[PDB]
Structure formats: structure tokens, C-alpha cells
Write a protein that binds this DNA or RNA. Structure first.
Ligand SMILES: [Zn+2]
Ligand SMILES: [Zn+2]
Lengths: 294, 94, 318, 665
DNA sequence: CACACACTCTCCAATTCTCTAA
DNA sequence: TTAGAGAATTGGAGAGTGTGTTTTTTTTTTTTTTTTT
């Protein structure tokens, strides 16, 4: 009956993913982490009885801030959610996109169901994010291999340098040359899904629709070159390095020469043989797409 | 030799088994209206069923386009008229 | 005989907000009134500036942003700040109507025929200043002020601002052809006898050129938080604002943050594409990527870093 | 041939330098033999453009600037030479060259048209010669601030000073000349672009429509400058005295002027019904609400983030859609799955006249300055209170005689002038109480009702839609007038009785064809039909029978097609449509007539958060209608399951099944 | 060289327009 | 008045033509100027 939503290639249901994560994102007492690792002699009423993510979200609302840090081990600490930790490691791009929206649903429920007096549009307009961290064992940059494509990984390194910030287009803006009508067109996998004709049925002209670069909307991309930490190197040779793309609010987190720990999805992309054709090299450029930096 | 002829809606597709008979079987089960929902969600529950079935019959075309095509074919084809009057004649017979 | 389609300008959609900005800016320029110099008095300072321009034949108007900020609850200053690049054609079209009202001598470059005058609207005195490291794509098309130190300045070069072309196939003329970041010839001949879509020549008498200069600036050597590498920005100066700075100087610029396309990938007349991932799927790109620089387009420039005759000096002092 | 062209340019350039010059002693001096040079240039216009249909002389007289460098300075100096003398109160020679300068101004400013009968050379130069006419209008309105319009009224005063009876026809000609000069200076209007279509489109469309010369802005040509220069040169006071003095020769040029500068002003700007900052603020809050809805549809992470959804469907099979927004919102997923389809069904889409309310966009508005807006409204209020009544009475006589000679341009500029003034004066008398309605009492007189109705009938019968559209507009306004005077209170009954059989069938056929024509045509048919039904309802031949003449599928089709444009409609026009759907649903119980699928999609597309604004008065009654519609649809479906196919297709006409389908036994 | 992209040319059939009889 | 047969125009398949592409760039010698040797 219901057309079920499934993460592609997985047999994982997005409704079950969401309706579990909501019921972790409230009702998680920090007590449960101090059961997971034990130290269970240490349990303190004031912190440990409090609803940890409720307090975090009420702070987010009052500060007017959009990003929730999440130590992934909490997902293992709570009975309903142990399998979601495994989904977060294996299917990051979708599981993070479910968590991002569940935060935004929660932020609204925390004022409208709670019938608290606050500005709704001030929350509806925000792009909320999860930033998951403490995701698993760290690994050597040199220990990466193609089994790891599209998984969360945890790396330690030295920043060599940052590019100056790069504008990445998020919404294209188009104008009809004949009729002055205009459209916001959604960017999808880096391709502009261009219209064939004017959207006004009173105009309907083909090919006359055109792009206006300074009325488009953009995200912030930055490349950090990250070197392997000298503790990890095999002593026969030089350290390696990996490029990483840092995005939106994480841009300029790092100075050159910072030591950092990063959580990101490990990515590979084909690259063009020649800039005038779609002929691609048979071995792919790789980078990490970061979701947290410490 | 030729170019391939265009695939196009016709009773030989539209009357065929996954088709109008599939609508008559499944739709009364899958489409639900209540005043307990807002009108915009009720409209969306109707439109889902027809959008997925139109995608199954004629994935070439968008939903509004498929409706304009169905209007022209039901206006013109005598076999499609005969099928529709046959459905109504059953309900009058009962 | 022909097969032809007539194509009528009246059916263009209007920006209702753009026209409500034009009216609010038009009313501000005449009425604004307030003065405190010498004594508490009314002056209509922007009308007083237009009547000053009428004497000297200057083609720029300076506007203090705090005057916009206090006017009409500041909704006009909010709109001009946040969406400057959308509203600028409406600001210029509003100013033209006010100049037509109070000083119609300025409305041309002012015998042969003398051209349309182009007006550089120069906002200044913003509430807040950004560093080169504070620049973020979220502020594209919005009016900032930027503080930095000049490392280089280019030649003063002519931009082709409004182009005019003649058709080699039929000898017709096309005019007022606006230029984006790339050079742009017309797609269709204006003569309905003519099948042409290419083969255009520029008329260098009738086409109109702005003055233009690139100046490269960097984050100030006292501001860099840890003595790391100095981050840089490309600033574009136009009209009267060219050569107003010098290398090693310290300047405050105000204007829009802009995205500049990498024009070789955009199919520029008679040039090869060059060789990070862009965006694709556009008629003018076909299979290519388009990629983007951040630049600044400055309307006003001020530095923060011998005429030996008494007949000039004693008039120079107050 | 080309030698003939370059010899023509050389001969006219040598005549152009022979007229005169600045003298440099600057004070423009007449050339010796100036009268003979002016008469020779008039001869050149006649003996080439009449005789051979060329336009080449009229083109090349703009190249050598004769209008802007000779004719204008000559008229403006002669105006000063007569103004000074009047304030002191061979001038008989200078009269003749002033007249001939006005003659050449009228010839150079004459409106351009292209037709089947147009020359291969005229159609070549047409789009170019419109640019030189734009330069002439700018220069006439701004050269010494319309002092030439002052010179034109002076040449009219020269014949107004001698009596209505004791005048000669060669002077009534000069009156017509001055009126034709003003109608021309008004109706210089920027040209159409035109493309040759023998060769198909490249990978971009027409990259600029901008039909303007290098030193003209769109504002230098606008009614703002026209109103400014007319008020500063006392033109309105001339037109007002002239239109009152009618107690035949000139009535039709005078109506032409009132049409040419009332045409594109939608009246409602003349009535408002920090203020500009509050108006700007409210509009920015509406654009903010729209961008909030776009932000709610946009990616919370970057373009490359790459999350991929699979949708399970019945027959236990998969589709796939990209993008983080689709994972959580099933409705967005299905919208994206339709958006990506690379097919489009080919659409089907649709003369010598000026751009007007027949042709300009429903949203178009001309932005008067505050002084200009008061100078305009005071002029037309004086004109309505003085001269409209007698002017309409005069031209409606002249055109009730002579109907068959009215080529389509006269027919429009009569019908639209009648409709615009009656609408404006109804609206003034709505807000102001000191406005009389009965000041336009002439509009309901039997001779004018008969003319308007005959003219629309003949245009419909001859299939001349531009005239039927103008007829439908004027008839809709006459109906508004009748309804208002009936509410205020026997001439109402005379006209209301006069349409009982045949005009009823006509006005019922109008919306049935409406779905084949422009948005402005459908809008006019809907406004007319709303007005008719409201009148016939108020009067009660048989309301049930006459409305059943309208309750037919072709009308519902044009109503759905007007409502498809709703994103560019106004709340008034949407309220008219939904009043008619309420009338069909509740008053007729016709409801099967509306159950077709096109309406169901269209309700969703406008009731959506992306559709109508939530704070709009318009959304409230759409939401109410939708609740009743879905209730009756649920009832019909529960009772008769075949309606799921009957809702997908158009209705049947096989008798027994067609009745059962429509009503459910 | 040869193999993709950019761009124009040409033919064919698909759809809508228009007229006639049921 | 509906509905069905015959005439005209537009869309786009697909055939055809034409253009650009590899690509590098430190290294090693010779010189002429500043200054730190
Ligand atoms: Zn358009
Ligand atoms: Zn040409």
C-alpha cells in the first residue's frame, strides 16, 4: 500500500531510520553512555538524568545556531538504535540527510507541540545539520583502499594549506530573454537541470531562457591538503597526504599547520582526460568530504 | 530503412490489462478521502495513484500531458467509447 | 516573400519590487531634506548634489548609506544592501528620472549629438566592514565594504559596455547590445528579410565603452591572525573610480561581491577552453564544466594609508 | 538602383543644409528661400512616398537630422516671436513657414503600419524607421521642454479666434492638422522586433528584444514625460476648451487623442483604494515568504553530497531518484520523478494596430509620478465633467451612419474609448460621492447601445476577433453601468429587454470559443459573463434556462484554462471564477460537469504552499470550495466506482448512460 | 590519420486544422 | 451538432559535415648587479 522509501541498494527503510532517530534524539539520558562504557559507579543525577539532546536543542534554539555535534557511540548506547550506528557508517550520505531533517522536525515539535512562545519562521528558514564524530577507530591515510568508498572514516593529520574559498552553485537562476520571466532551478549531482522553454504558457519560447550568474545561490567549498601524521608513517619512506573538501559552516575551521581529527565520507570521482570531452581516466581522484572537524 | 515509429497512447495500450481494468480493481482500495485531512493532502492521495499508474502505462510523458492525451483519445476512439459505456451499463443493470 | 514572426516588447513581465525600489529611491533623492551644517536647516542634500553636478558635468552621485538607513524605517536600505545586484538597474532608472526633473542638462554627456550619460551611483559610509577572510558566497550580489592593502593595479582599459553591430549579410544595424562577462554578438538579424544569425561587425563610433581597472588586494599585515599566508581578492574599479588607489596603500572599497565565470569554458568567440569540478548541463557548455571566481565590483574607493599658488590654496581651505 | 538611393540621400542632404543655421552672431537664422526649401521637401515626401510606396526619403531625412536641427528650432523661435508680441499687446510671412514646419512634423510623425499590401521596400525599412520616430518623440517632448507643443496650440488659436460659422474649410483643416500632430506625438510607441523563420532557431533564442536607438531610454518616451510636457505647455487646457466648444469636422481626431493616451493606463493606479516604504516592505515580506518556500525545497548540504533514494511501488518493483530532499518527502520524490521526463507534448499558440488593453499583459501598470498622477486625474475629471457626454453623442452619430467604412482601427478606438471612460467614471463615483454617474448618462442611450451591439455582432459574424474582443470589453462595461444605475434607482429596462433571444446566444457562444485565444480575451469573456449572470439573477426571461445555456463543457474548459494562468491573475479574477464554480455546484447541482481531472491537478497546484500565498484572501475560498468538492467526489465514487475512469475522460452523449453518469439515477 | 562534440540540413510522419455528411 | 475523412504545418531522427586533440617547462650555462661577502 504505502510506496516504501528505501536507501538505494540496501533494503533499509527510511521511515524506520527516521522514527528510530527521533526517539533517540529525545529520551536519551546521558546515563545510558555511562552504562555502555560502564564507569557505572560514577553516575551523577544532575547531568546523567537530564535528557541530553533536549538540553542541546533548547540551547541551539536560543543561541540561534544550526549544527548539532553527535558522538556516534551514543547510537550504540541506546537499545532501539544500535543498528542505526551500522547504517550511519555504511550509508552516510542518506543517513546524515535523514538526521539533518529529523533535527529540523524536532526543533519545530519542541516549540509547537510544547506550545512555547517563539518565532516559527526563524526555525523554518534554517538549514539544520548533524555533525557526527567519534565514529569508529581512526585509521592510517595509507591504509585506505576501494572497499572504503562511500563510508564514514576518521583521520588524523597536519594541514599543509587551504585554498581560498570556492563558490559551489546550489541554485541556478534563469531569465527569459524575450519575456523577462525568471526561475530558480535546482542543481542536482552538479548538473544544472536546465529548462527547454519559458515556463510562462503565455510565452513558451524554446532556447530563449538564459543563466544569470550573480543571481544564482552558492555554497562554500574549501580544499584542505592534509598530510599523514609522523607517528603513523612506515619509517622506510615519506608521509602521504590526502585532499579533503570542507563545506559550509566548517570553511576556515583550520589554520595551516593545525593538527586535526576529521570525520568525513571517503569519495572517489572520475576526472576528464581532456577538458573538451567526457572521456574519463580509468583511475579516480579521491578525497574526503568532511562532516566534522576537531 | 525507416525511422522507428513513435510510441503513442491508443486503446490497444490504454484498454490492455494493466490499464483501465487495473484502475477499476486497485483504485477504490488505494485512494482514501477524509475531512480528517486537509484538502491538499486528499488531492495528493488521489494524484499519487494515477501518477504511478500513468508512469507504468506511458513513462514517456508527464502527468498533465498524459491527461491531455487521454482527453483527445477518449474523444476520438469508438472502441474506448464502447468500453466506457459498457462500464456504466453494468452499474445501471445492477 | 518572407516567412516571419513579429515579437513584441510590451508582453515582458515587470519586477514589481524593482519598480517599488525605483519609486522609493526617486522620492528619497528629492525629498531627503536633513542638514546640520552652519545651523539646523533644510537643504535637500541629494538635489543640492545634482545641482552641483549640473555645473561641472560630473557623471557620479555619492550616497551616504546612513541617510538611506534612517529613511522610511530602513526597508529601502535593507533591500539595496541585501540584493544590490538585482536592484541596481532600478536605482539607475530611478536616478535618471530625478536628474530629468532637476537637471536635464546632465541627462546627456553634454555641435554633434552628445550621448546618453552613464551614472556611477557610489554608496559609502556603511555600518560595517568585512575582511578578505570574512568573504563567503552567501553574500554574492549584496553591498559590502572591504578593507585591504593593494598589491597590484592593472592598466586602465576600456570595457565594451553597450555594443552596436552591423549585419554583413544585409547591412542592418543592432544597438544597445548589453555585454555579460563574455563578448556577445546578436543571435538574430532585426531585418525580417534576413536569415542571418552570425557574421556581425562592431560599429566603434556608436558602441559605448566604460573605463575599467583590476586591482589586487590582500588581508592587512597587522590583521592576519597568526602570521599565516596573506589571502587575496580581485577588485574591479569602473568609471571615475579607476586609479583612485596605488600599490602598498591601504584602502576601503564598497560595492558588490560578484561571481565571475571562467569565460573560456563559456564558449568565448575565437578562443580555446582551458584545463576543480564545475557545473554542467547548459546549452552554451554542451559537455564542458563552468567554474567560478569570487571578485568584488567596487563603486566607491577611499584610502586610509604641488599647486604652489595662493589663488588656489586659499580657495582649497575652508 | 543603389546609385538612385545615394543620389536621393545627396539631394536631400543638400536641401537639409539649405534651410538655415545657428548664425553665430546661438540665435538660429532662417536661410534665404526657406519657404521654397520647405515646400520642396513636402513635394519630395508626396511625390516619392505616395507615388512609389518607398519610405526612402522619410528614412534619409532622419539621417540628416532635419527635424531635430531645423524644424524644431524654427517653430520654437517663431513661438517666442509671437509670445513676446502677445505680451506687448514679416509676421505674415513667418506664419507660412511655421505652418509648413508643422505640416512636415505631421508627415514625419505619421504612424507606421505594415500589411499584405505593403511594399517589399517598406517592410525592409519599417523596424528601422520606428527608431527615428522614437528620437523625434524624445526631441519634441524635451527640446526647450515642449515649446513646440506651445507653437502647435498657437497655430490652432489662430483659427479658434475666428467664429464657428465664419471659418473656412482650409482652416478646419488646420484644426485637424494640430489634432493629428498631438495624436502622433502621443502614439509614437517602441516597435515590434521581427525575425525571419525560414531558418530554425540556434541553441539560444532571441537574445535581445530591445528596439530603442542608442541615446533613448524607455522613460524618455513614457506617458510620464508626455503628461509633464502637456501640463507645462497648457495642452490640457486647450484640449478641454476644444472638446467643450463642439456646439463634426474634428470629433474623430479628438476621440483618437483620448484613446491614444488613455489606452495603457489601467485605471486602478489613479485610486490608492513613508507610504511607498510600507508598500515596499509588504512586497519584500511576500518575496521573503516565496524564498522561504524555495528554501524549504532546497538542499540542506552541497550539490555533490549524492544521497540516492529507491521507491518501492505496487507490482513490487523499484524506481530511483537523487537528492537529499527526496529521501524524506514522498511528494517531492514523485514531483522530481515527473520533472526529469525528457518529453514535452507540443503546445499550440496564436495586424495593424497600437499596443493597448487588448494586447498588453494583465499585470502591466504604468508608474506615474505623484505630480503627474494628479495632473492626469484632474485633466480627465475636467474632460468627463465637460466634454465626454457631447463627444460620445457626436461620434456615435457619425459612426451609426457609415458603419461599413470603419476599418478595424476606427472600430477599436471607438469601442475602447467608450469602455475606458465609463469604467473610470463608475470607479470615481464609487469612491467619491460628488462624482455623478449620470455625467456619462449618454452611454446608456439607445443609439449608442445599438451601435456597440451591432458592431460586436458584425465582428463576431465576420470572425474579426480583435474587434469582437474590443466589443466584449465595451459590452462588459455597459453592463456594469446598467447594474449600477438599477441599484441607484426606465432606459435600463429598455436595454435589458432589448437582449432577450439572439445576443443571449452570442454571449453564450463567446466563452465556448474563448479557450482558443489569448489570456486577455478569456479574461474579458469571464468578466462579461460574471456581469451578465449577476444582472439576469437580479432581474429574476428564466434564470434557470439561460444559465443552463452556459452550463456546458466548453465553458468549463475555458474557465480551467484561465485558471491555469493563476500565478499571474489577481484575486478579483480568481474570485469571479470560483463564484461561477460555486454557482455550478450549489445552484445547479451539475457537479459531474466539473469532476474532470484537469481541475483536480489545478486545485492542488494552487492550494500548495508553492501555489497561492497562505495569507491571501484568495486561498480561503479555494480551500472552502475544495472541501465541498472532495466531499461530493467521495460520495459519487462510493456510490458509482466507474467514476474513476469517467473522471479521467470527457463526458458521454449516448443518452441513458450519459444521464446516469451525470446525475447518479 | 580517428573518434567525439558542435551544428546544419533534409525528409518523413504525427498532430492539428478545416470541410463534409450522418 | 457530433463525428469522421482529407489537407497543411511542425518536430526531430538521423544523416551529414566540420573541427580539435599531444603537451612540456625543469634543467644547465651565461650574463650582469647587489650585497653580503
Ligand atoms: Zn518567456
Ligand atoms: Zn541581416
Amino acid at each position: 500500500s504505502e510506496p516504501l522509501r528505501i536507501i538505494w541498494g540496501t533494503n533499509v527503510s527510511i521511515q524506520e531510520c527516521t522514527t528510530n532517530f527521533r526517539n533517540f534524539l529525545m529520551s536519551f539520558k546521558y546515563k545510558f553512555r555511562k552504562i555502555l562504557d560502564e564507569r557505572e559507579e560514577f553516575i551523577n543525577n544532575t547531568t546523567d538524568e537530564e535528557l541530553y539532546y533536549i538540553k542541546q536543542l533548547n540551547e541551539m534554539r536560543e543561541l540561534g545556531t544550526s549544527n548539532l555535534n553527535l558522538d556516534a557511540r551514543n547510537l550504540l548506547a541506546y537499545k532501539q538504535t544500535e543498528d542505526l550506528y551500522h547504517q550511519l557508517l555504511n550509508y552516510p550520505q542518506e543517513v546524515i540527510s535523514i538526521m539533518d531533517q529529523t533535527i529540523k522536525d524536532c526543533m519545530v515539535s519542541l516549540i509547537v507541540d510544547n506550545n512555547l512562545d517563539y518565532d516559527l519562521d526563524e526555525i523554518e528558514t534554517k538549514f539544520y545539520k548533524v555533525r557526527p564524530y567519534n565514529v569508529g577507530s581512526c585509521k592510517g591515510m595509507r591504509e585506505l583502499n576501494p572497499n572504503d568508498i562511500d563510508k564514514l572514516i576518521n583521520l588524523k593529520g597536519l594541514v599543509l594549506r587551504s585554498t581560498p574559498v570556492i563558490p559551489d552553485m546550489k541554485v541556478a537562476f534563469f531569465k527569459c530573454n524575450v519575456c523577462d520571466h525568471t526561475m530558480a532551478v535546482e542543481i542536482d549531482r552538479g548538473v544544472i537541470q536546465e529548462p527547454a522553454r519559458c515556463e510562462r504558457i503565455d510565452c513558451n519560447e524554446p532556447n530563449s531562457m538564459s543563466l544569470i550568474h550573480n543571481r544564482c545561490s552558492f555554497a562554500d567549498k574549501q580544499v584542505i591538503k592534509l598530510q599523514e601524521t609522523p607517528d603513523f608513517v612506515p619509517d622506510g619512506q615519506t608521509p602521504h597526504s590526502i585532499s579533503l573538501c570542507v563545506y559550509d559552516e566548517l570553511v576556515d575551521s583550520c589554520r595551516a599547520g593545525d593538527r586535526i581529527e576529521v570525520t568525513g565520507t571517503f569519495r572517489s570521482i572520475p576526472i576528464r582526460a581532456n577538458s573538451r570531452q567526457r572521456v574519463l581516466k580509468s583511475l579516480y581522484k579521491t578525497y574526503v568530504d568532511v562532516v566534522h572537524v576537531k | 530503412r525507416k525511422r522507428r515509429p513513435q510510441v503513442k497512447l491508443t486503446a490497444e495500450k490504454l484498454l490492455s490489462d494493466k490499464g483501465l481494468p487495473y484502475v477499476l480493481k486497485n483504485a477504490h482500495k488505494r485512494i482514501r478521502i477524509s475531512s480528517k485531512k486537509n484538502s491538499y493532502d486528499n488531492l495528493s492521495n488521489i494524484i499519487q495513484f494515477y501518477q504511478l499508474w500513468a508512469h507504468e502505462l506511458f513513462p514517456k510523458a508527464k502527468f498533465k500531458d498524459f491527461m491531455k492525451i487521454c482527453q483527445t483519445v477518449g474523444k476520438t476512439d469508438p472502441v474506448l467509447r464502447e468500453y466506457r459505456v459498457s462500464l456504466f451499463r453494468d452499474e445501471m443493470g445492477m | 516573400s518572407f516567412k516571419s514572426r513579429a515579437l513584441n516588447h510590451v508582453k515582458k513581465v515587470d519586477d514589481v519590487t524593482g519598480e517599488k525600489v525605483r519609486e522609493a529611491f526617486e522620492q528619497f533623492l528629492e525629498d531627503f531634506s536633513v542638514q546640520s551644517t552652519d545651523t539646523g536647516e533644510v537643504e535637500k542634500v541629494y538635489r543640492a548634489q545634482i545641482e552641483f553636478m549640473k555645473i561641472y558635468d560630473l557623471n557620479t552621485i555619492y550616497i551616504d548609506y546612513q541617510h538611506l538607513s534612517m529613511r522610511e524605517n530602513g526597508a529601502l536600505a535593507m533591500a539595496i544592501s541585501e540584493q544590490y545586484y538585482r536592484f541596481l538597474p532600478f536605482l539607475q532608472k530611478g536616478l535618471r528620472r530625478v536628474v530629468r526633473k532637476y537637471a536635464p542638462e546632465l541627462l546627456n554627456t553634454s555641435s554633434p549629438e552628445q550621448t546618453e550619460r552613464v551614472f556611477q551611483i557610489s554608496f559609502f559610509n556603511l555600518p560595517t566592514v568585512h575582511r578578505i577572510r570574512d568573504i563567503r558566497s552567501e553574500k554574492i550580489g549584496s553591498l559590502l565594504s572591504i578593507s585591504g592593502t593593494v598589491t597590484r593595479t592593472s592598466e586602465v582599459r576600456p570595457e565594451l559596455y553597450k555594443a552596436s553591430f552591423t549585419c554583413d549579410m544585409c547591412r542592418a544595424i543592432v544597438d544597445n547590445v548589453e555585454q555579460s562577462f563574455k563578448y556577445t554578438e546578436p543571435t538574430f538579424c532585426p531585418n525580417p528579410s534576413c536569415e542571418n544569425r552570425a557574421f556581425w561587425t562592431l560599429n566603434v563610433t556608436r558602441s559605448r565603452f566604460l573605463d575599467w581597472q583590476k586591482v589586487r588586494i590582500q588581508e592587512n599585515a597587522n590583521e592576519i591572525p597568526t602570521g599565516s599566508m596573506p589571502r587575496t581578492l580581485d577588485v574591479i574599479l569602473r568609471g571615475d573610480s579607476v586609479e583612485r588607489a596605488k600599490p602598498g596603500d591601504r584602502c576601503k572599497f564598497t560595492g558588490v561581491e560578484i561571481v565571475v565565470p571562467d569565460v573560456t569554458q563559456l564558449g568565448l568567440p575565437g578562443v580555446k577552453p582551458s584545463s576543480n569540478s564545475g557545473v554542467t548541463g547548459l546549452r552554451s557548455l554542451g559537455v564542458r564544466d563552468l567554474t567560478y571566481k569570487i571578485s568584488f565590483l567596487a563603486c566607491h574607493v577611499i584610502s586610509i594609508g604641488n599647486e604652489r599658488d595662493q589663488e588656489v590654496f586659499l580657495n582649497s581651505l575652508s | 538602383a543603389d546609385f538612385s538611393l545615394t543620389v536621393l540621400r545627396a539631394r536631400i542632404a543638400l536641401l537639409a543644409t539649405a534651410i538655415g543655421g545657428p548664425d553665430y552672431t546661438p540665435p538660429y537664422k532662417l536661410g534665404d528661400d526657406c519657404l521654397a526649401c520647405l515646400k520642396d521637401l513636402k513635394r519630395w515626401f508626396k511625390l516619392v512616398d505616395d507615388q512609389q510606396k518607398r519610405w526612402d526619403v522619410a528614412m534619409a531625412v532622419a539621417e540628416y537630422r532635419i527635424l531635430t536641427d531645423d524644424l524644431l528650432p524654427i517653430l520654437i523661435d517663431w513661438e517666442n516671436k509671437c509670445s513676446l508680441a502677445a505680451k506687448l499687446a514679416n509676421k505674415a510671412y513667418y506664419d507660412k513657414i511655421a505652418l509648413n514646419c508643422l505640416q512636415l512634423l505631421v508627415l514625419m510623425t505619421w504612424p507606421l503600419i505594415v500589411t499584405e499590401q505593403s511594399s517589399s521596400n517598406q517592410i525592409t525599412l519599417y523596424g528601422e524607421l520606428k527608431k527615428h520616430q522614437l528620437v523625434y518623440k524624445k526631441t519634441i517632448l524635451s527640446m526647450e521642454s515642449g515649446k513646440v507643443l506651445r507653437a502647435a496650440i498657437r497655430l490652432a488659436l489662430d483659427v479658434i479666434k475666428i467664429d464657428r460659422l465664419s471659418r473656412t474649410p482650409r482652416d478646419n483643416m488646420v484644426l485637424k492638422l494640430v489634432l493629428n500632430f498631438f495624436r502622433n506625438v502621443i502614439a509614437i510607441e517602441p516597435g515590434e522586433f521581427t525575425i525571419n523563420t525560414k531558418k530554425s532557431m540556434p541553441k539560444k533564442g532571441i537574445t535581445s528584444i530591445d528596439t530603442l536607438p542608442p541615446n533613448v531610454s524607455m522613460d524618455d518616451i513614457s506617458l510620464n514625460t508626455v503628461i509633464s510636457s502637456f501640463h507645462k505647455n497648457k495642452v490640457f487646457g486647450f484640449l478641454l476648451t476644444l472638446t467643450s466648444s463642439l456646439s463634426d469636422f474634428i470629433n474623430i481626431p479628438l476621440l483618437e487623442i483620448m484613446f491614444y493616451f488613455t489606452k495603457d493606463v489601467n485605471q486602478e493606479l489613479l485610486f490608492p483604494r513613508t507610504s511607498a516604504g510600507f508598500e515596499l516592505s509588504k512586497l519584500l515580506q511576500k518575496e521573503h515568504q516565496m524564498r522561504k518556500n524555495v528554501i524549504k525545497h532546497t538542499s540542506a548540504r552541497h550539490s555533490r553530497f549524492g544521497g540516492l533514494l529507491s521507491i518501492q511501488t505496487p507490482d513490487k518493483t523499484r524506481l530511483t531518484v537523487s537528492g537529499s530532499q527526496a529521501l524524506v518527502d514522498e511528494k517531492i520524490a514523485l514531483q522530481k520523478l515527473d520533472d526529469s521526463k525528457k518529453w514535452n507534448k507540443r503546445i499550440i499558440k496564436k495586424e495593424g494596430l497600437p499596443n493597448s488593453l487588448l494586447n498588453s499583459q494583465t499585470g502591466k501598470a504604468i508608474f506615474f509620478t505623484e505630480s503627474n498622477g494628479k495632473h492626469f486625474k484632474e485633466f480627465i475629471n475636467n474632460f468627463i465633467d465637460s466634454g465626454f457626454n457631447i463627444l460620445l453623442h457626436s461620434v456615435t452619430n457619425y459612426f451609426t451612419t457609415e458603419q461599413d467604412r470603419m476599418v478595424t482601427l476606427e472600430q477599436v478606438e471607438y469601442l475602447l474609448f467608450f469602455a475606458w471612460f465609463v469604467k473610470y467614471q463608475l470607479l470615481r463615483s464609487k469612491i467619491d460621492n460628488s462624482a455623478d454617474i449620470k455625467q456619462v448618462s449618454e452611454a446608456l442611450k439607445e443609439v449608442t447601445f445599438i451601435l456597440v451591439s451591432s458592431l460586436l455582432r458584425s465582428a463576431y459574424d465576420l470572425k474579426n476577433w480583435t474587434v469582437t474582443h474590443a466589443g466584449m470589453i465595451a459590452f462588459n462595461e455597459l453592463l456594469n453601468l446598467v447594474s449600477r444605475t438599477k441599484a441607484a434607482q426606465d432606459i435600463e429596462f429598455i436595454v435589458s429587454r432589448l437582449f432577450s433571444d439572439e445576443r443571449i446566444q452570442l454571449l453564450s457562444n463567446l466563452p465556448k470559443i474563448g479557450s482558443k485565444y489569448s489570456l486577455q480575451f478569456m479574461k474579458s469573456c469571464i468578466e462579461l459573463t460574471h456581469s451578465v449572470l449577476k444582472v439576469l439573477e437580479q432581474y429574476s426571461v428564466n434564470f434557470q434556462k439561460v444559465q443552463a445555456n452556459y452550463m456546458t463543457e466548453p465553458v468549463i474548459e475555458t474557465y480551467i484554462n484561465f485558471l491555469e494562468r493563476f500565478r499571474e491573475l489577481e484575486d478579483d479574477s480568481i474570485k469571479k471564477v470560483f463564484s461561477f464554480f460555486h454557482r455550478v455546484f450549489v445552484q445547479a447541482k451539475e457537479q459531474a460537469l466539473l469532476f474532470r481531472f484537469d481541475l483536480i491537478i489545478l486545485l492542488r497546484e494552487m492550494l500548495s504552499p508553492d501555489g497561492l500565498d497562505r495569507m491571501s484572501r484568495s486561498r480561503k475560498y479555494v480551500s472552502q470550495f475544495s472541501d465541498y468538492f472532495l466531499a461530493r467526489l467521495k460520495k459519487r465514487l462510493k456510490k458509482s466506482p466507474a467514476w474513476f475512469v469517467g473522471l479521467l475522460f470527457p463526458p458521454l452523449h449516448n443518452s441513458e448512460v450519459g444521464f446516469y453518469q451525470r446525475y447518479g439515477e
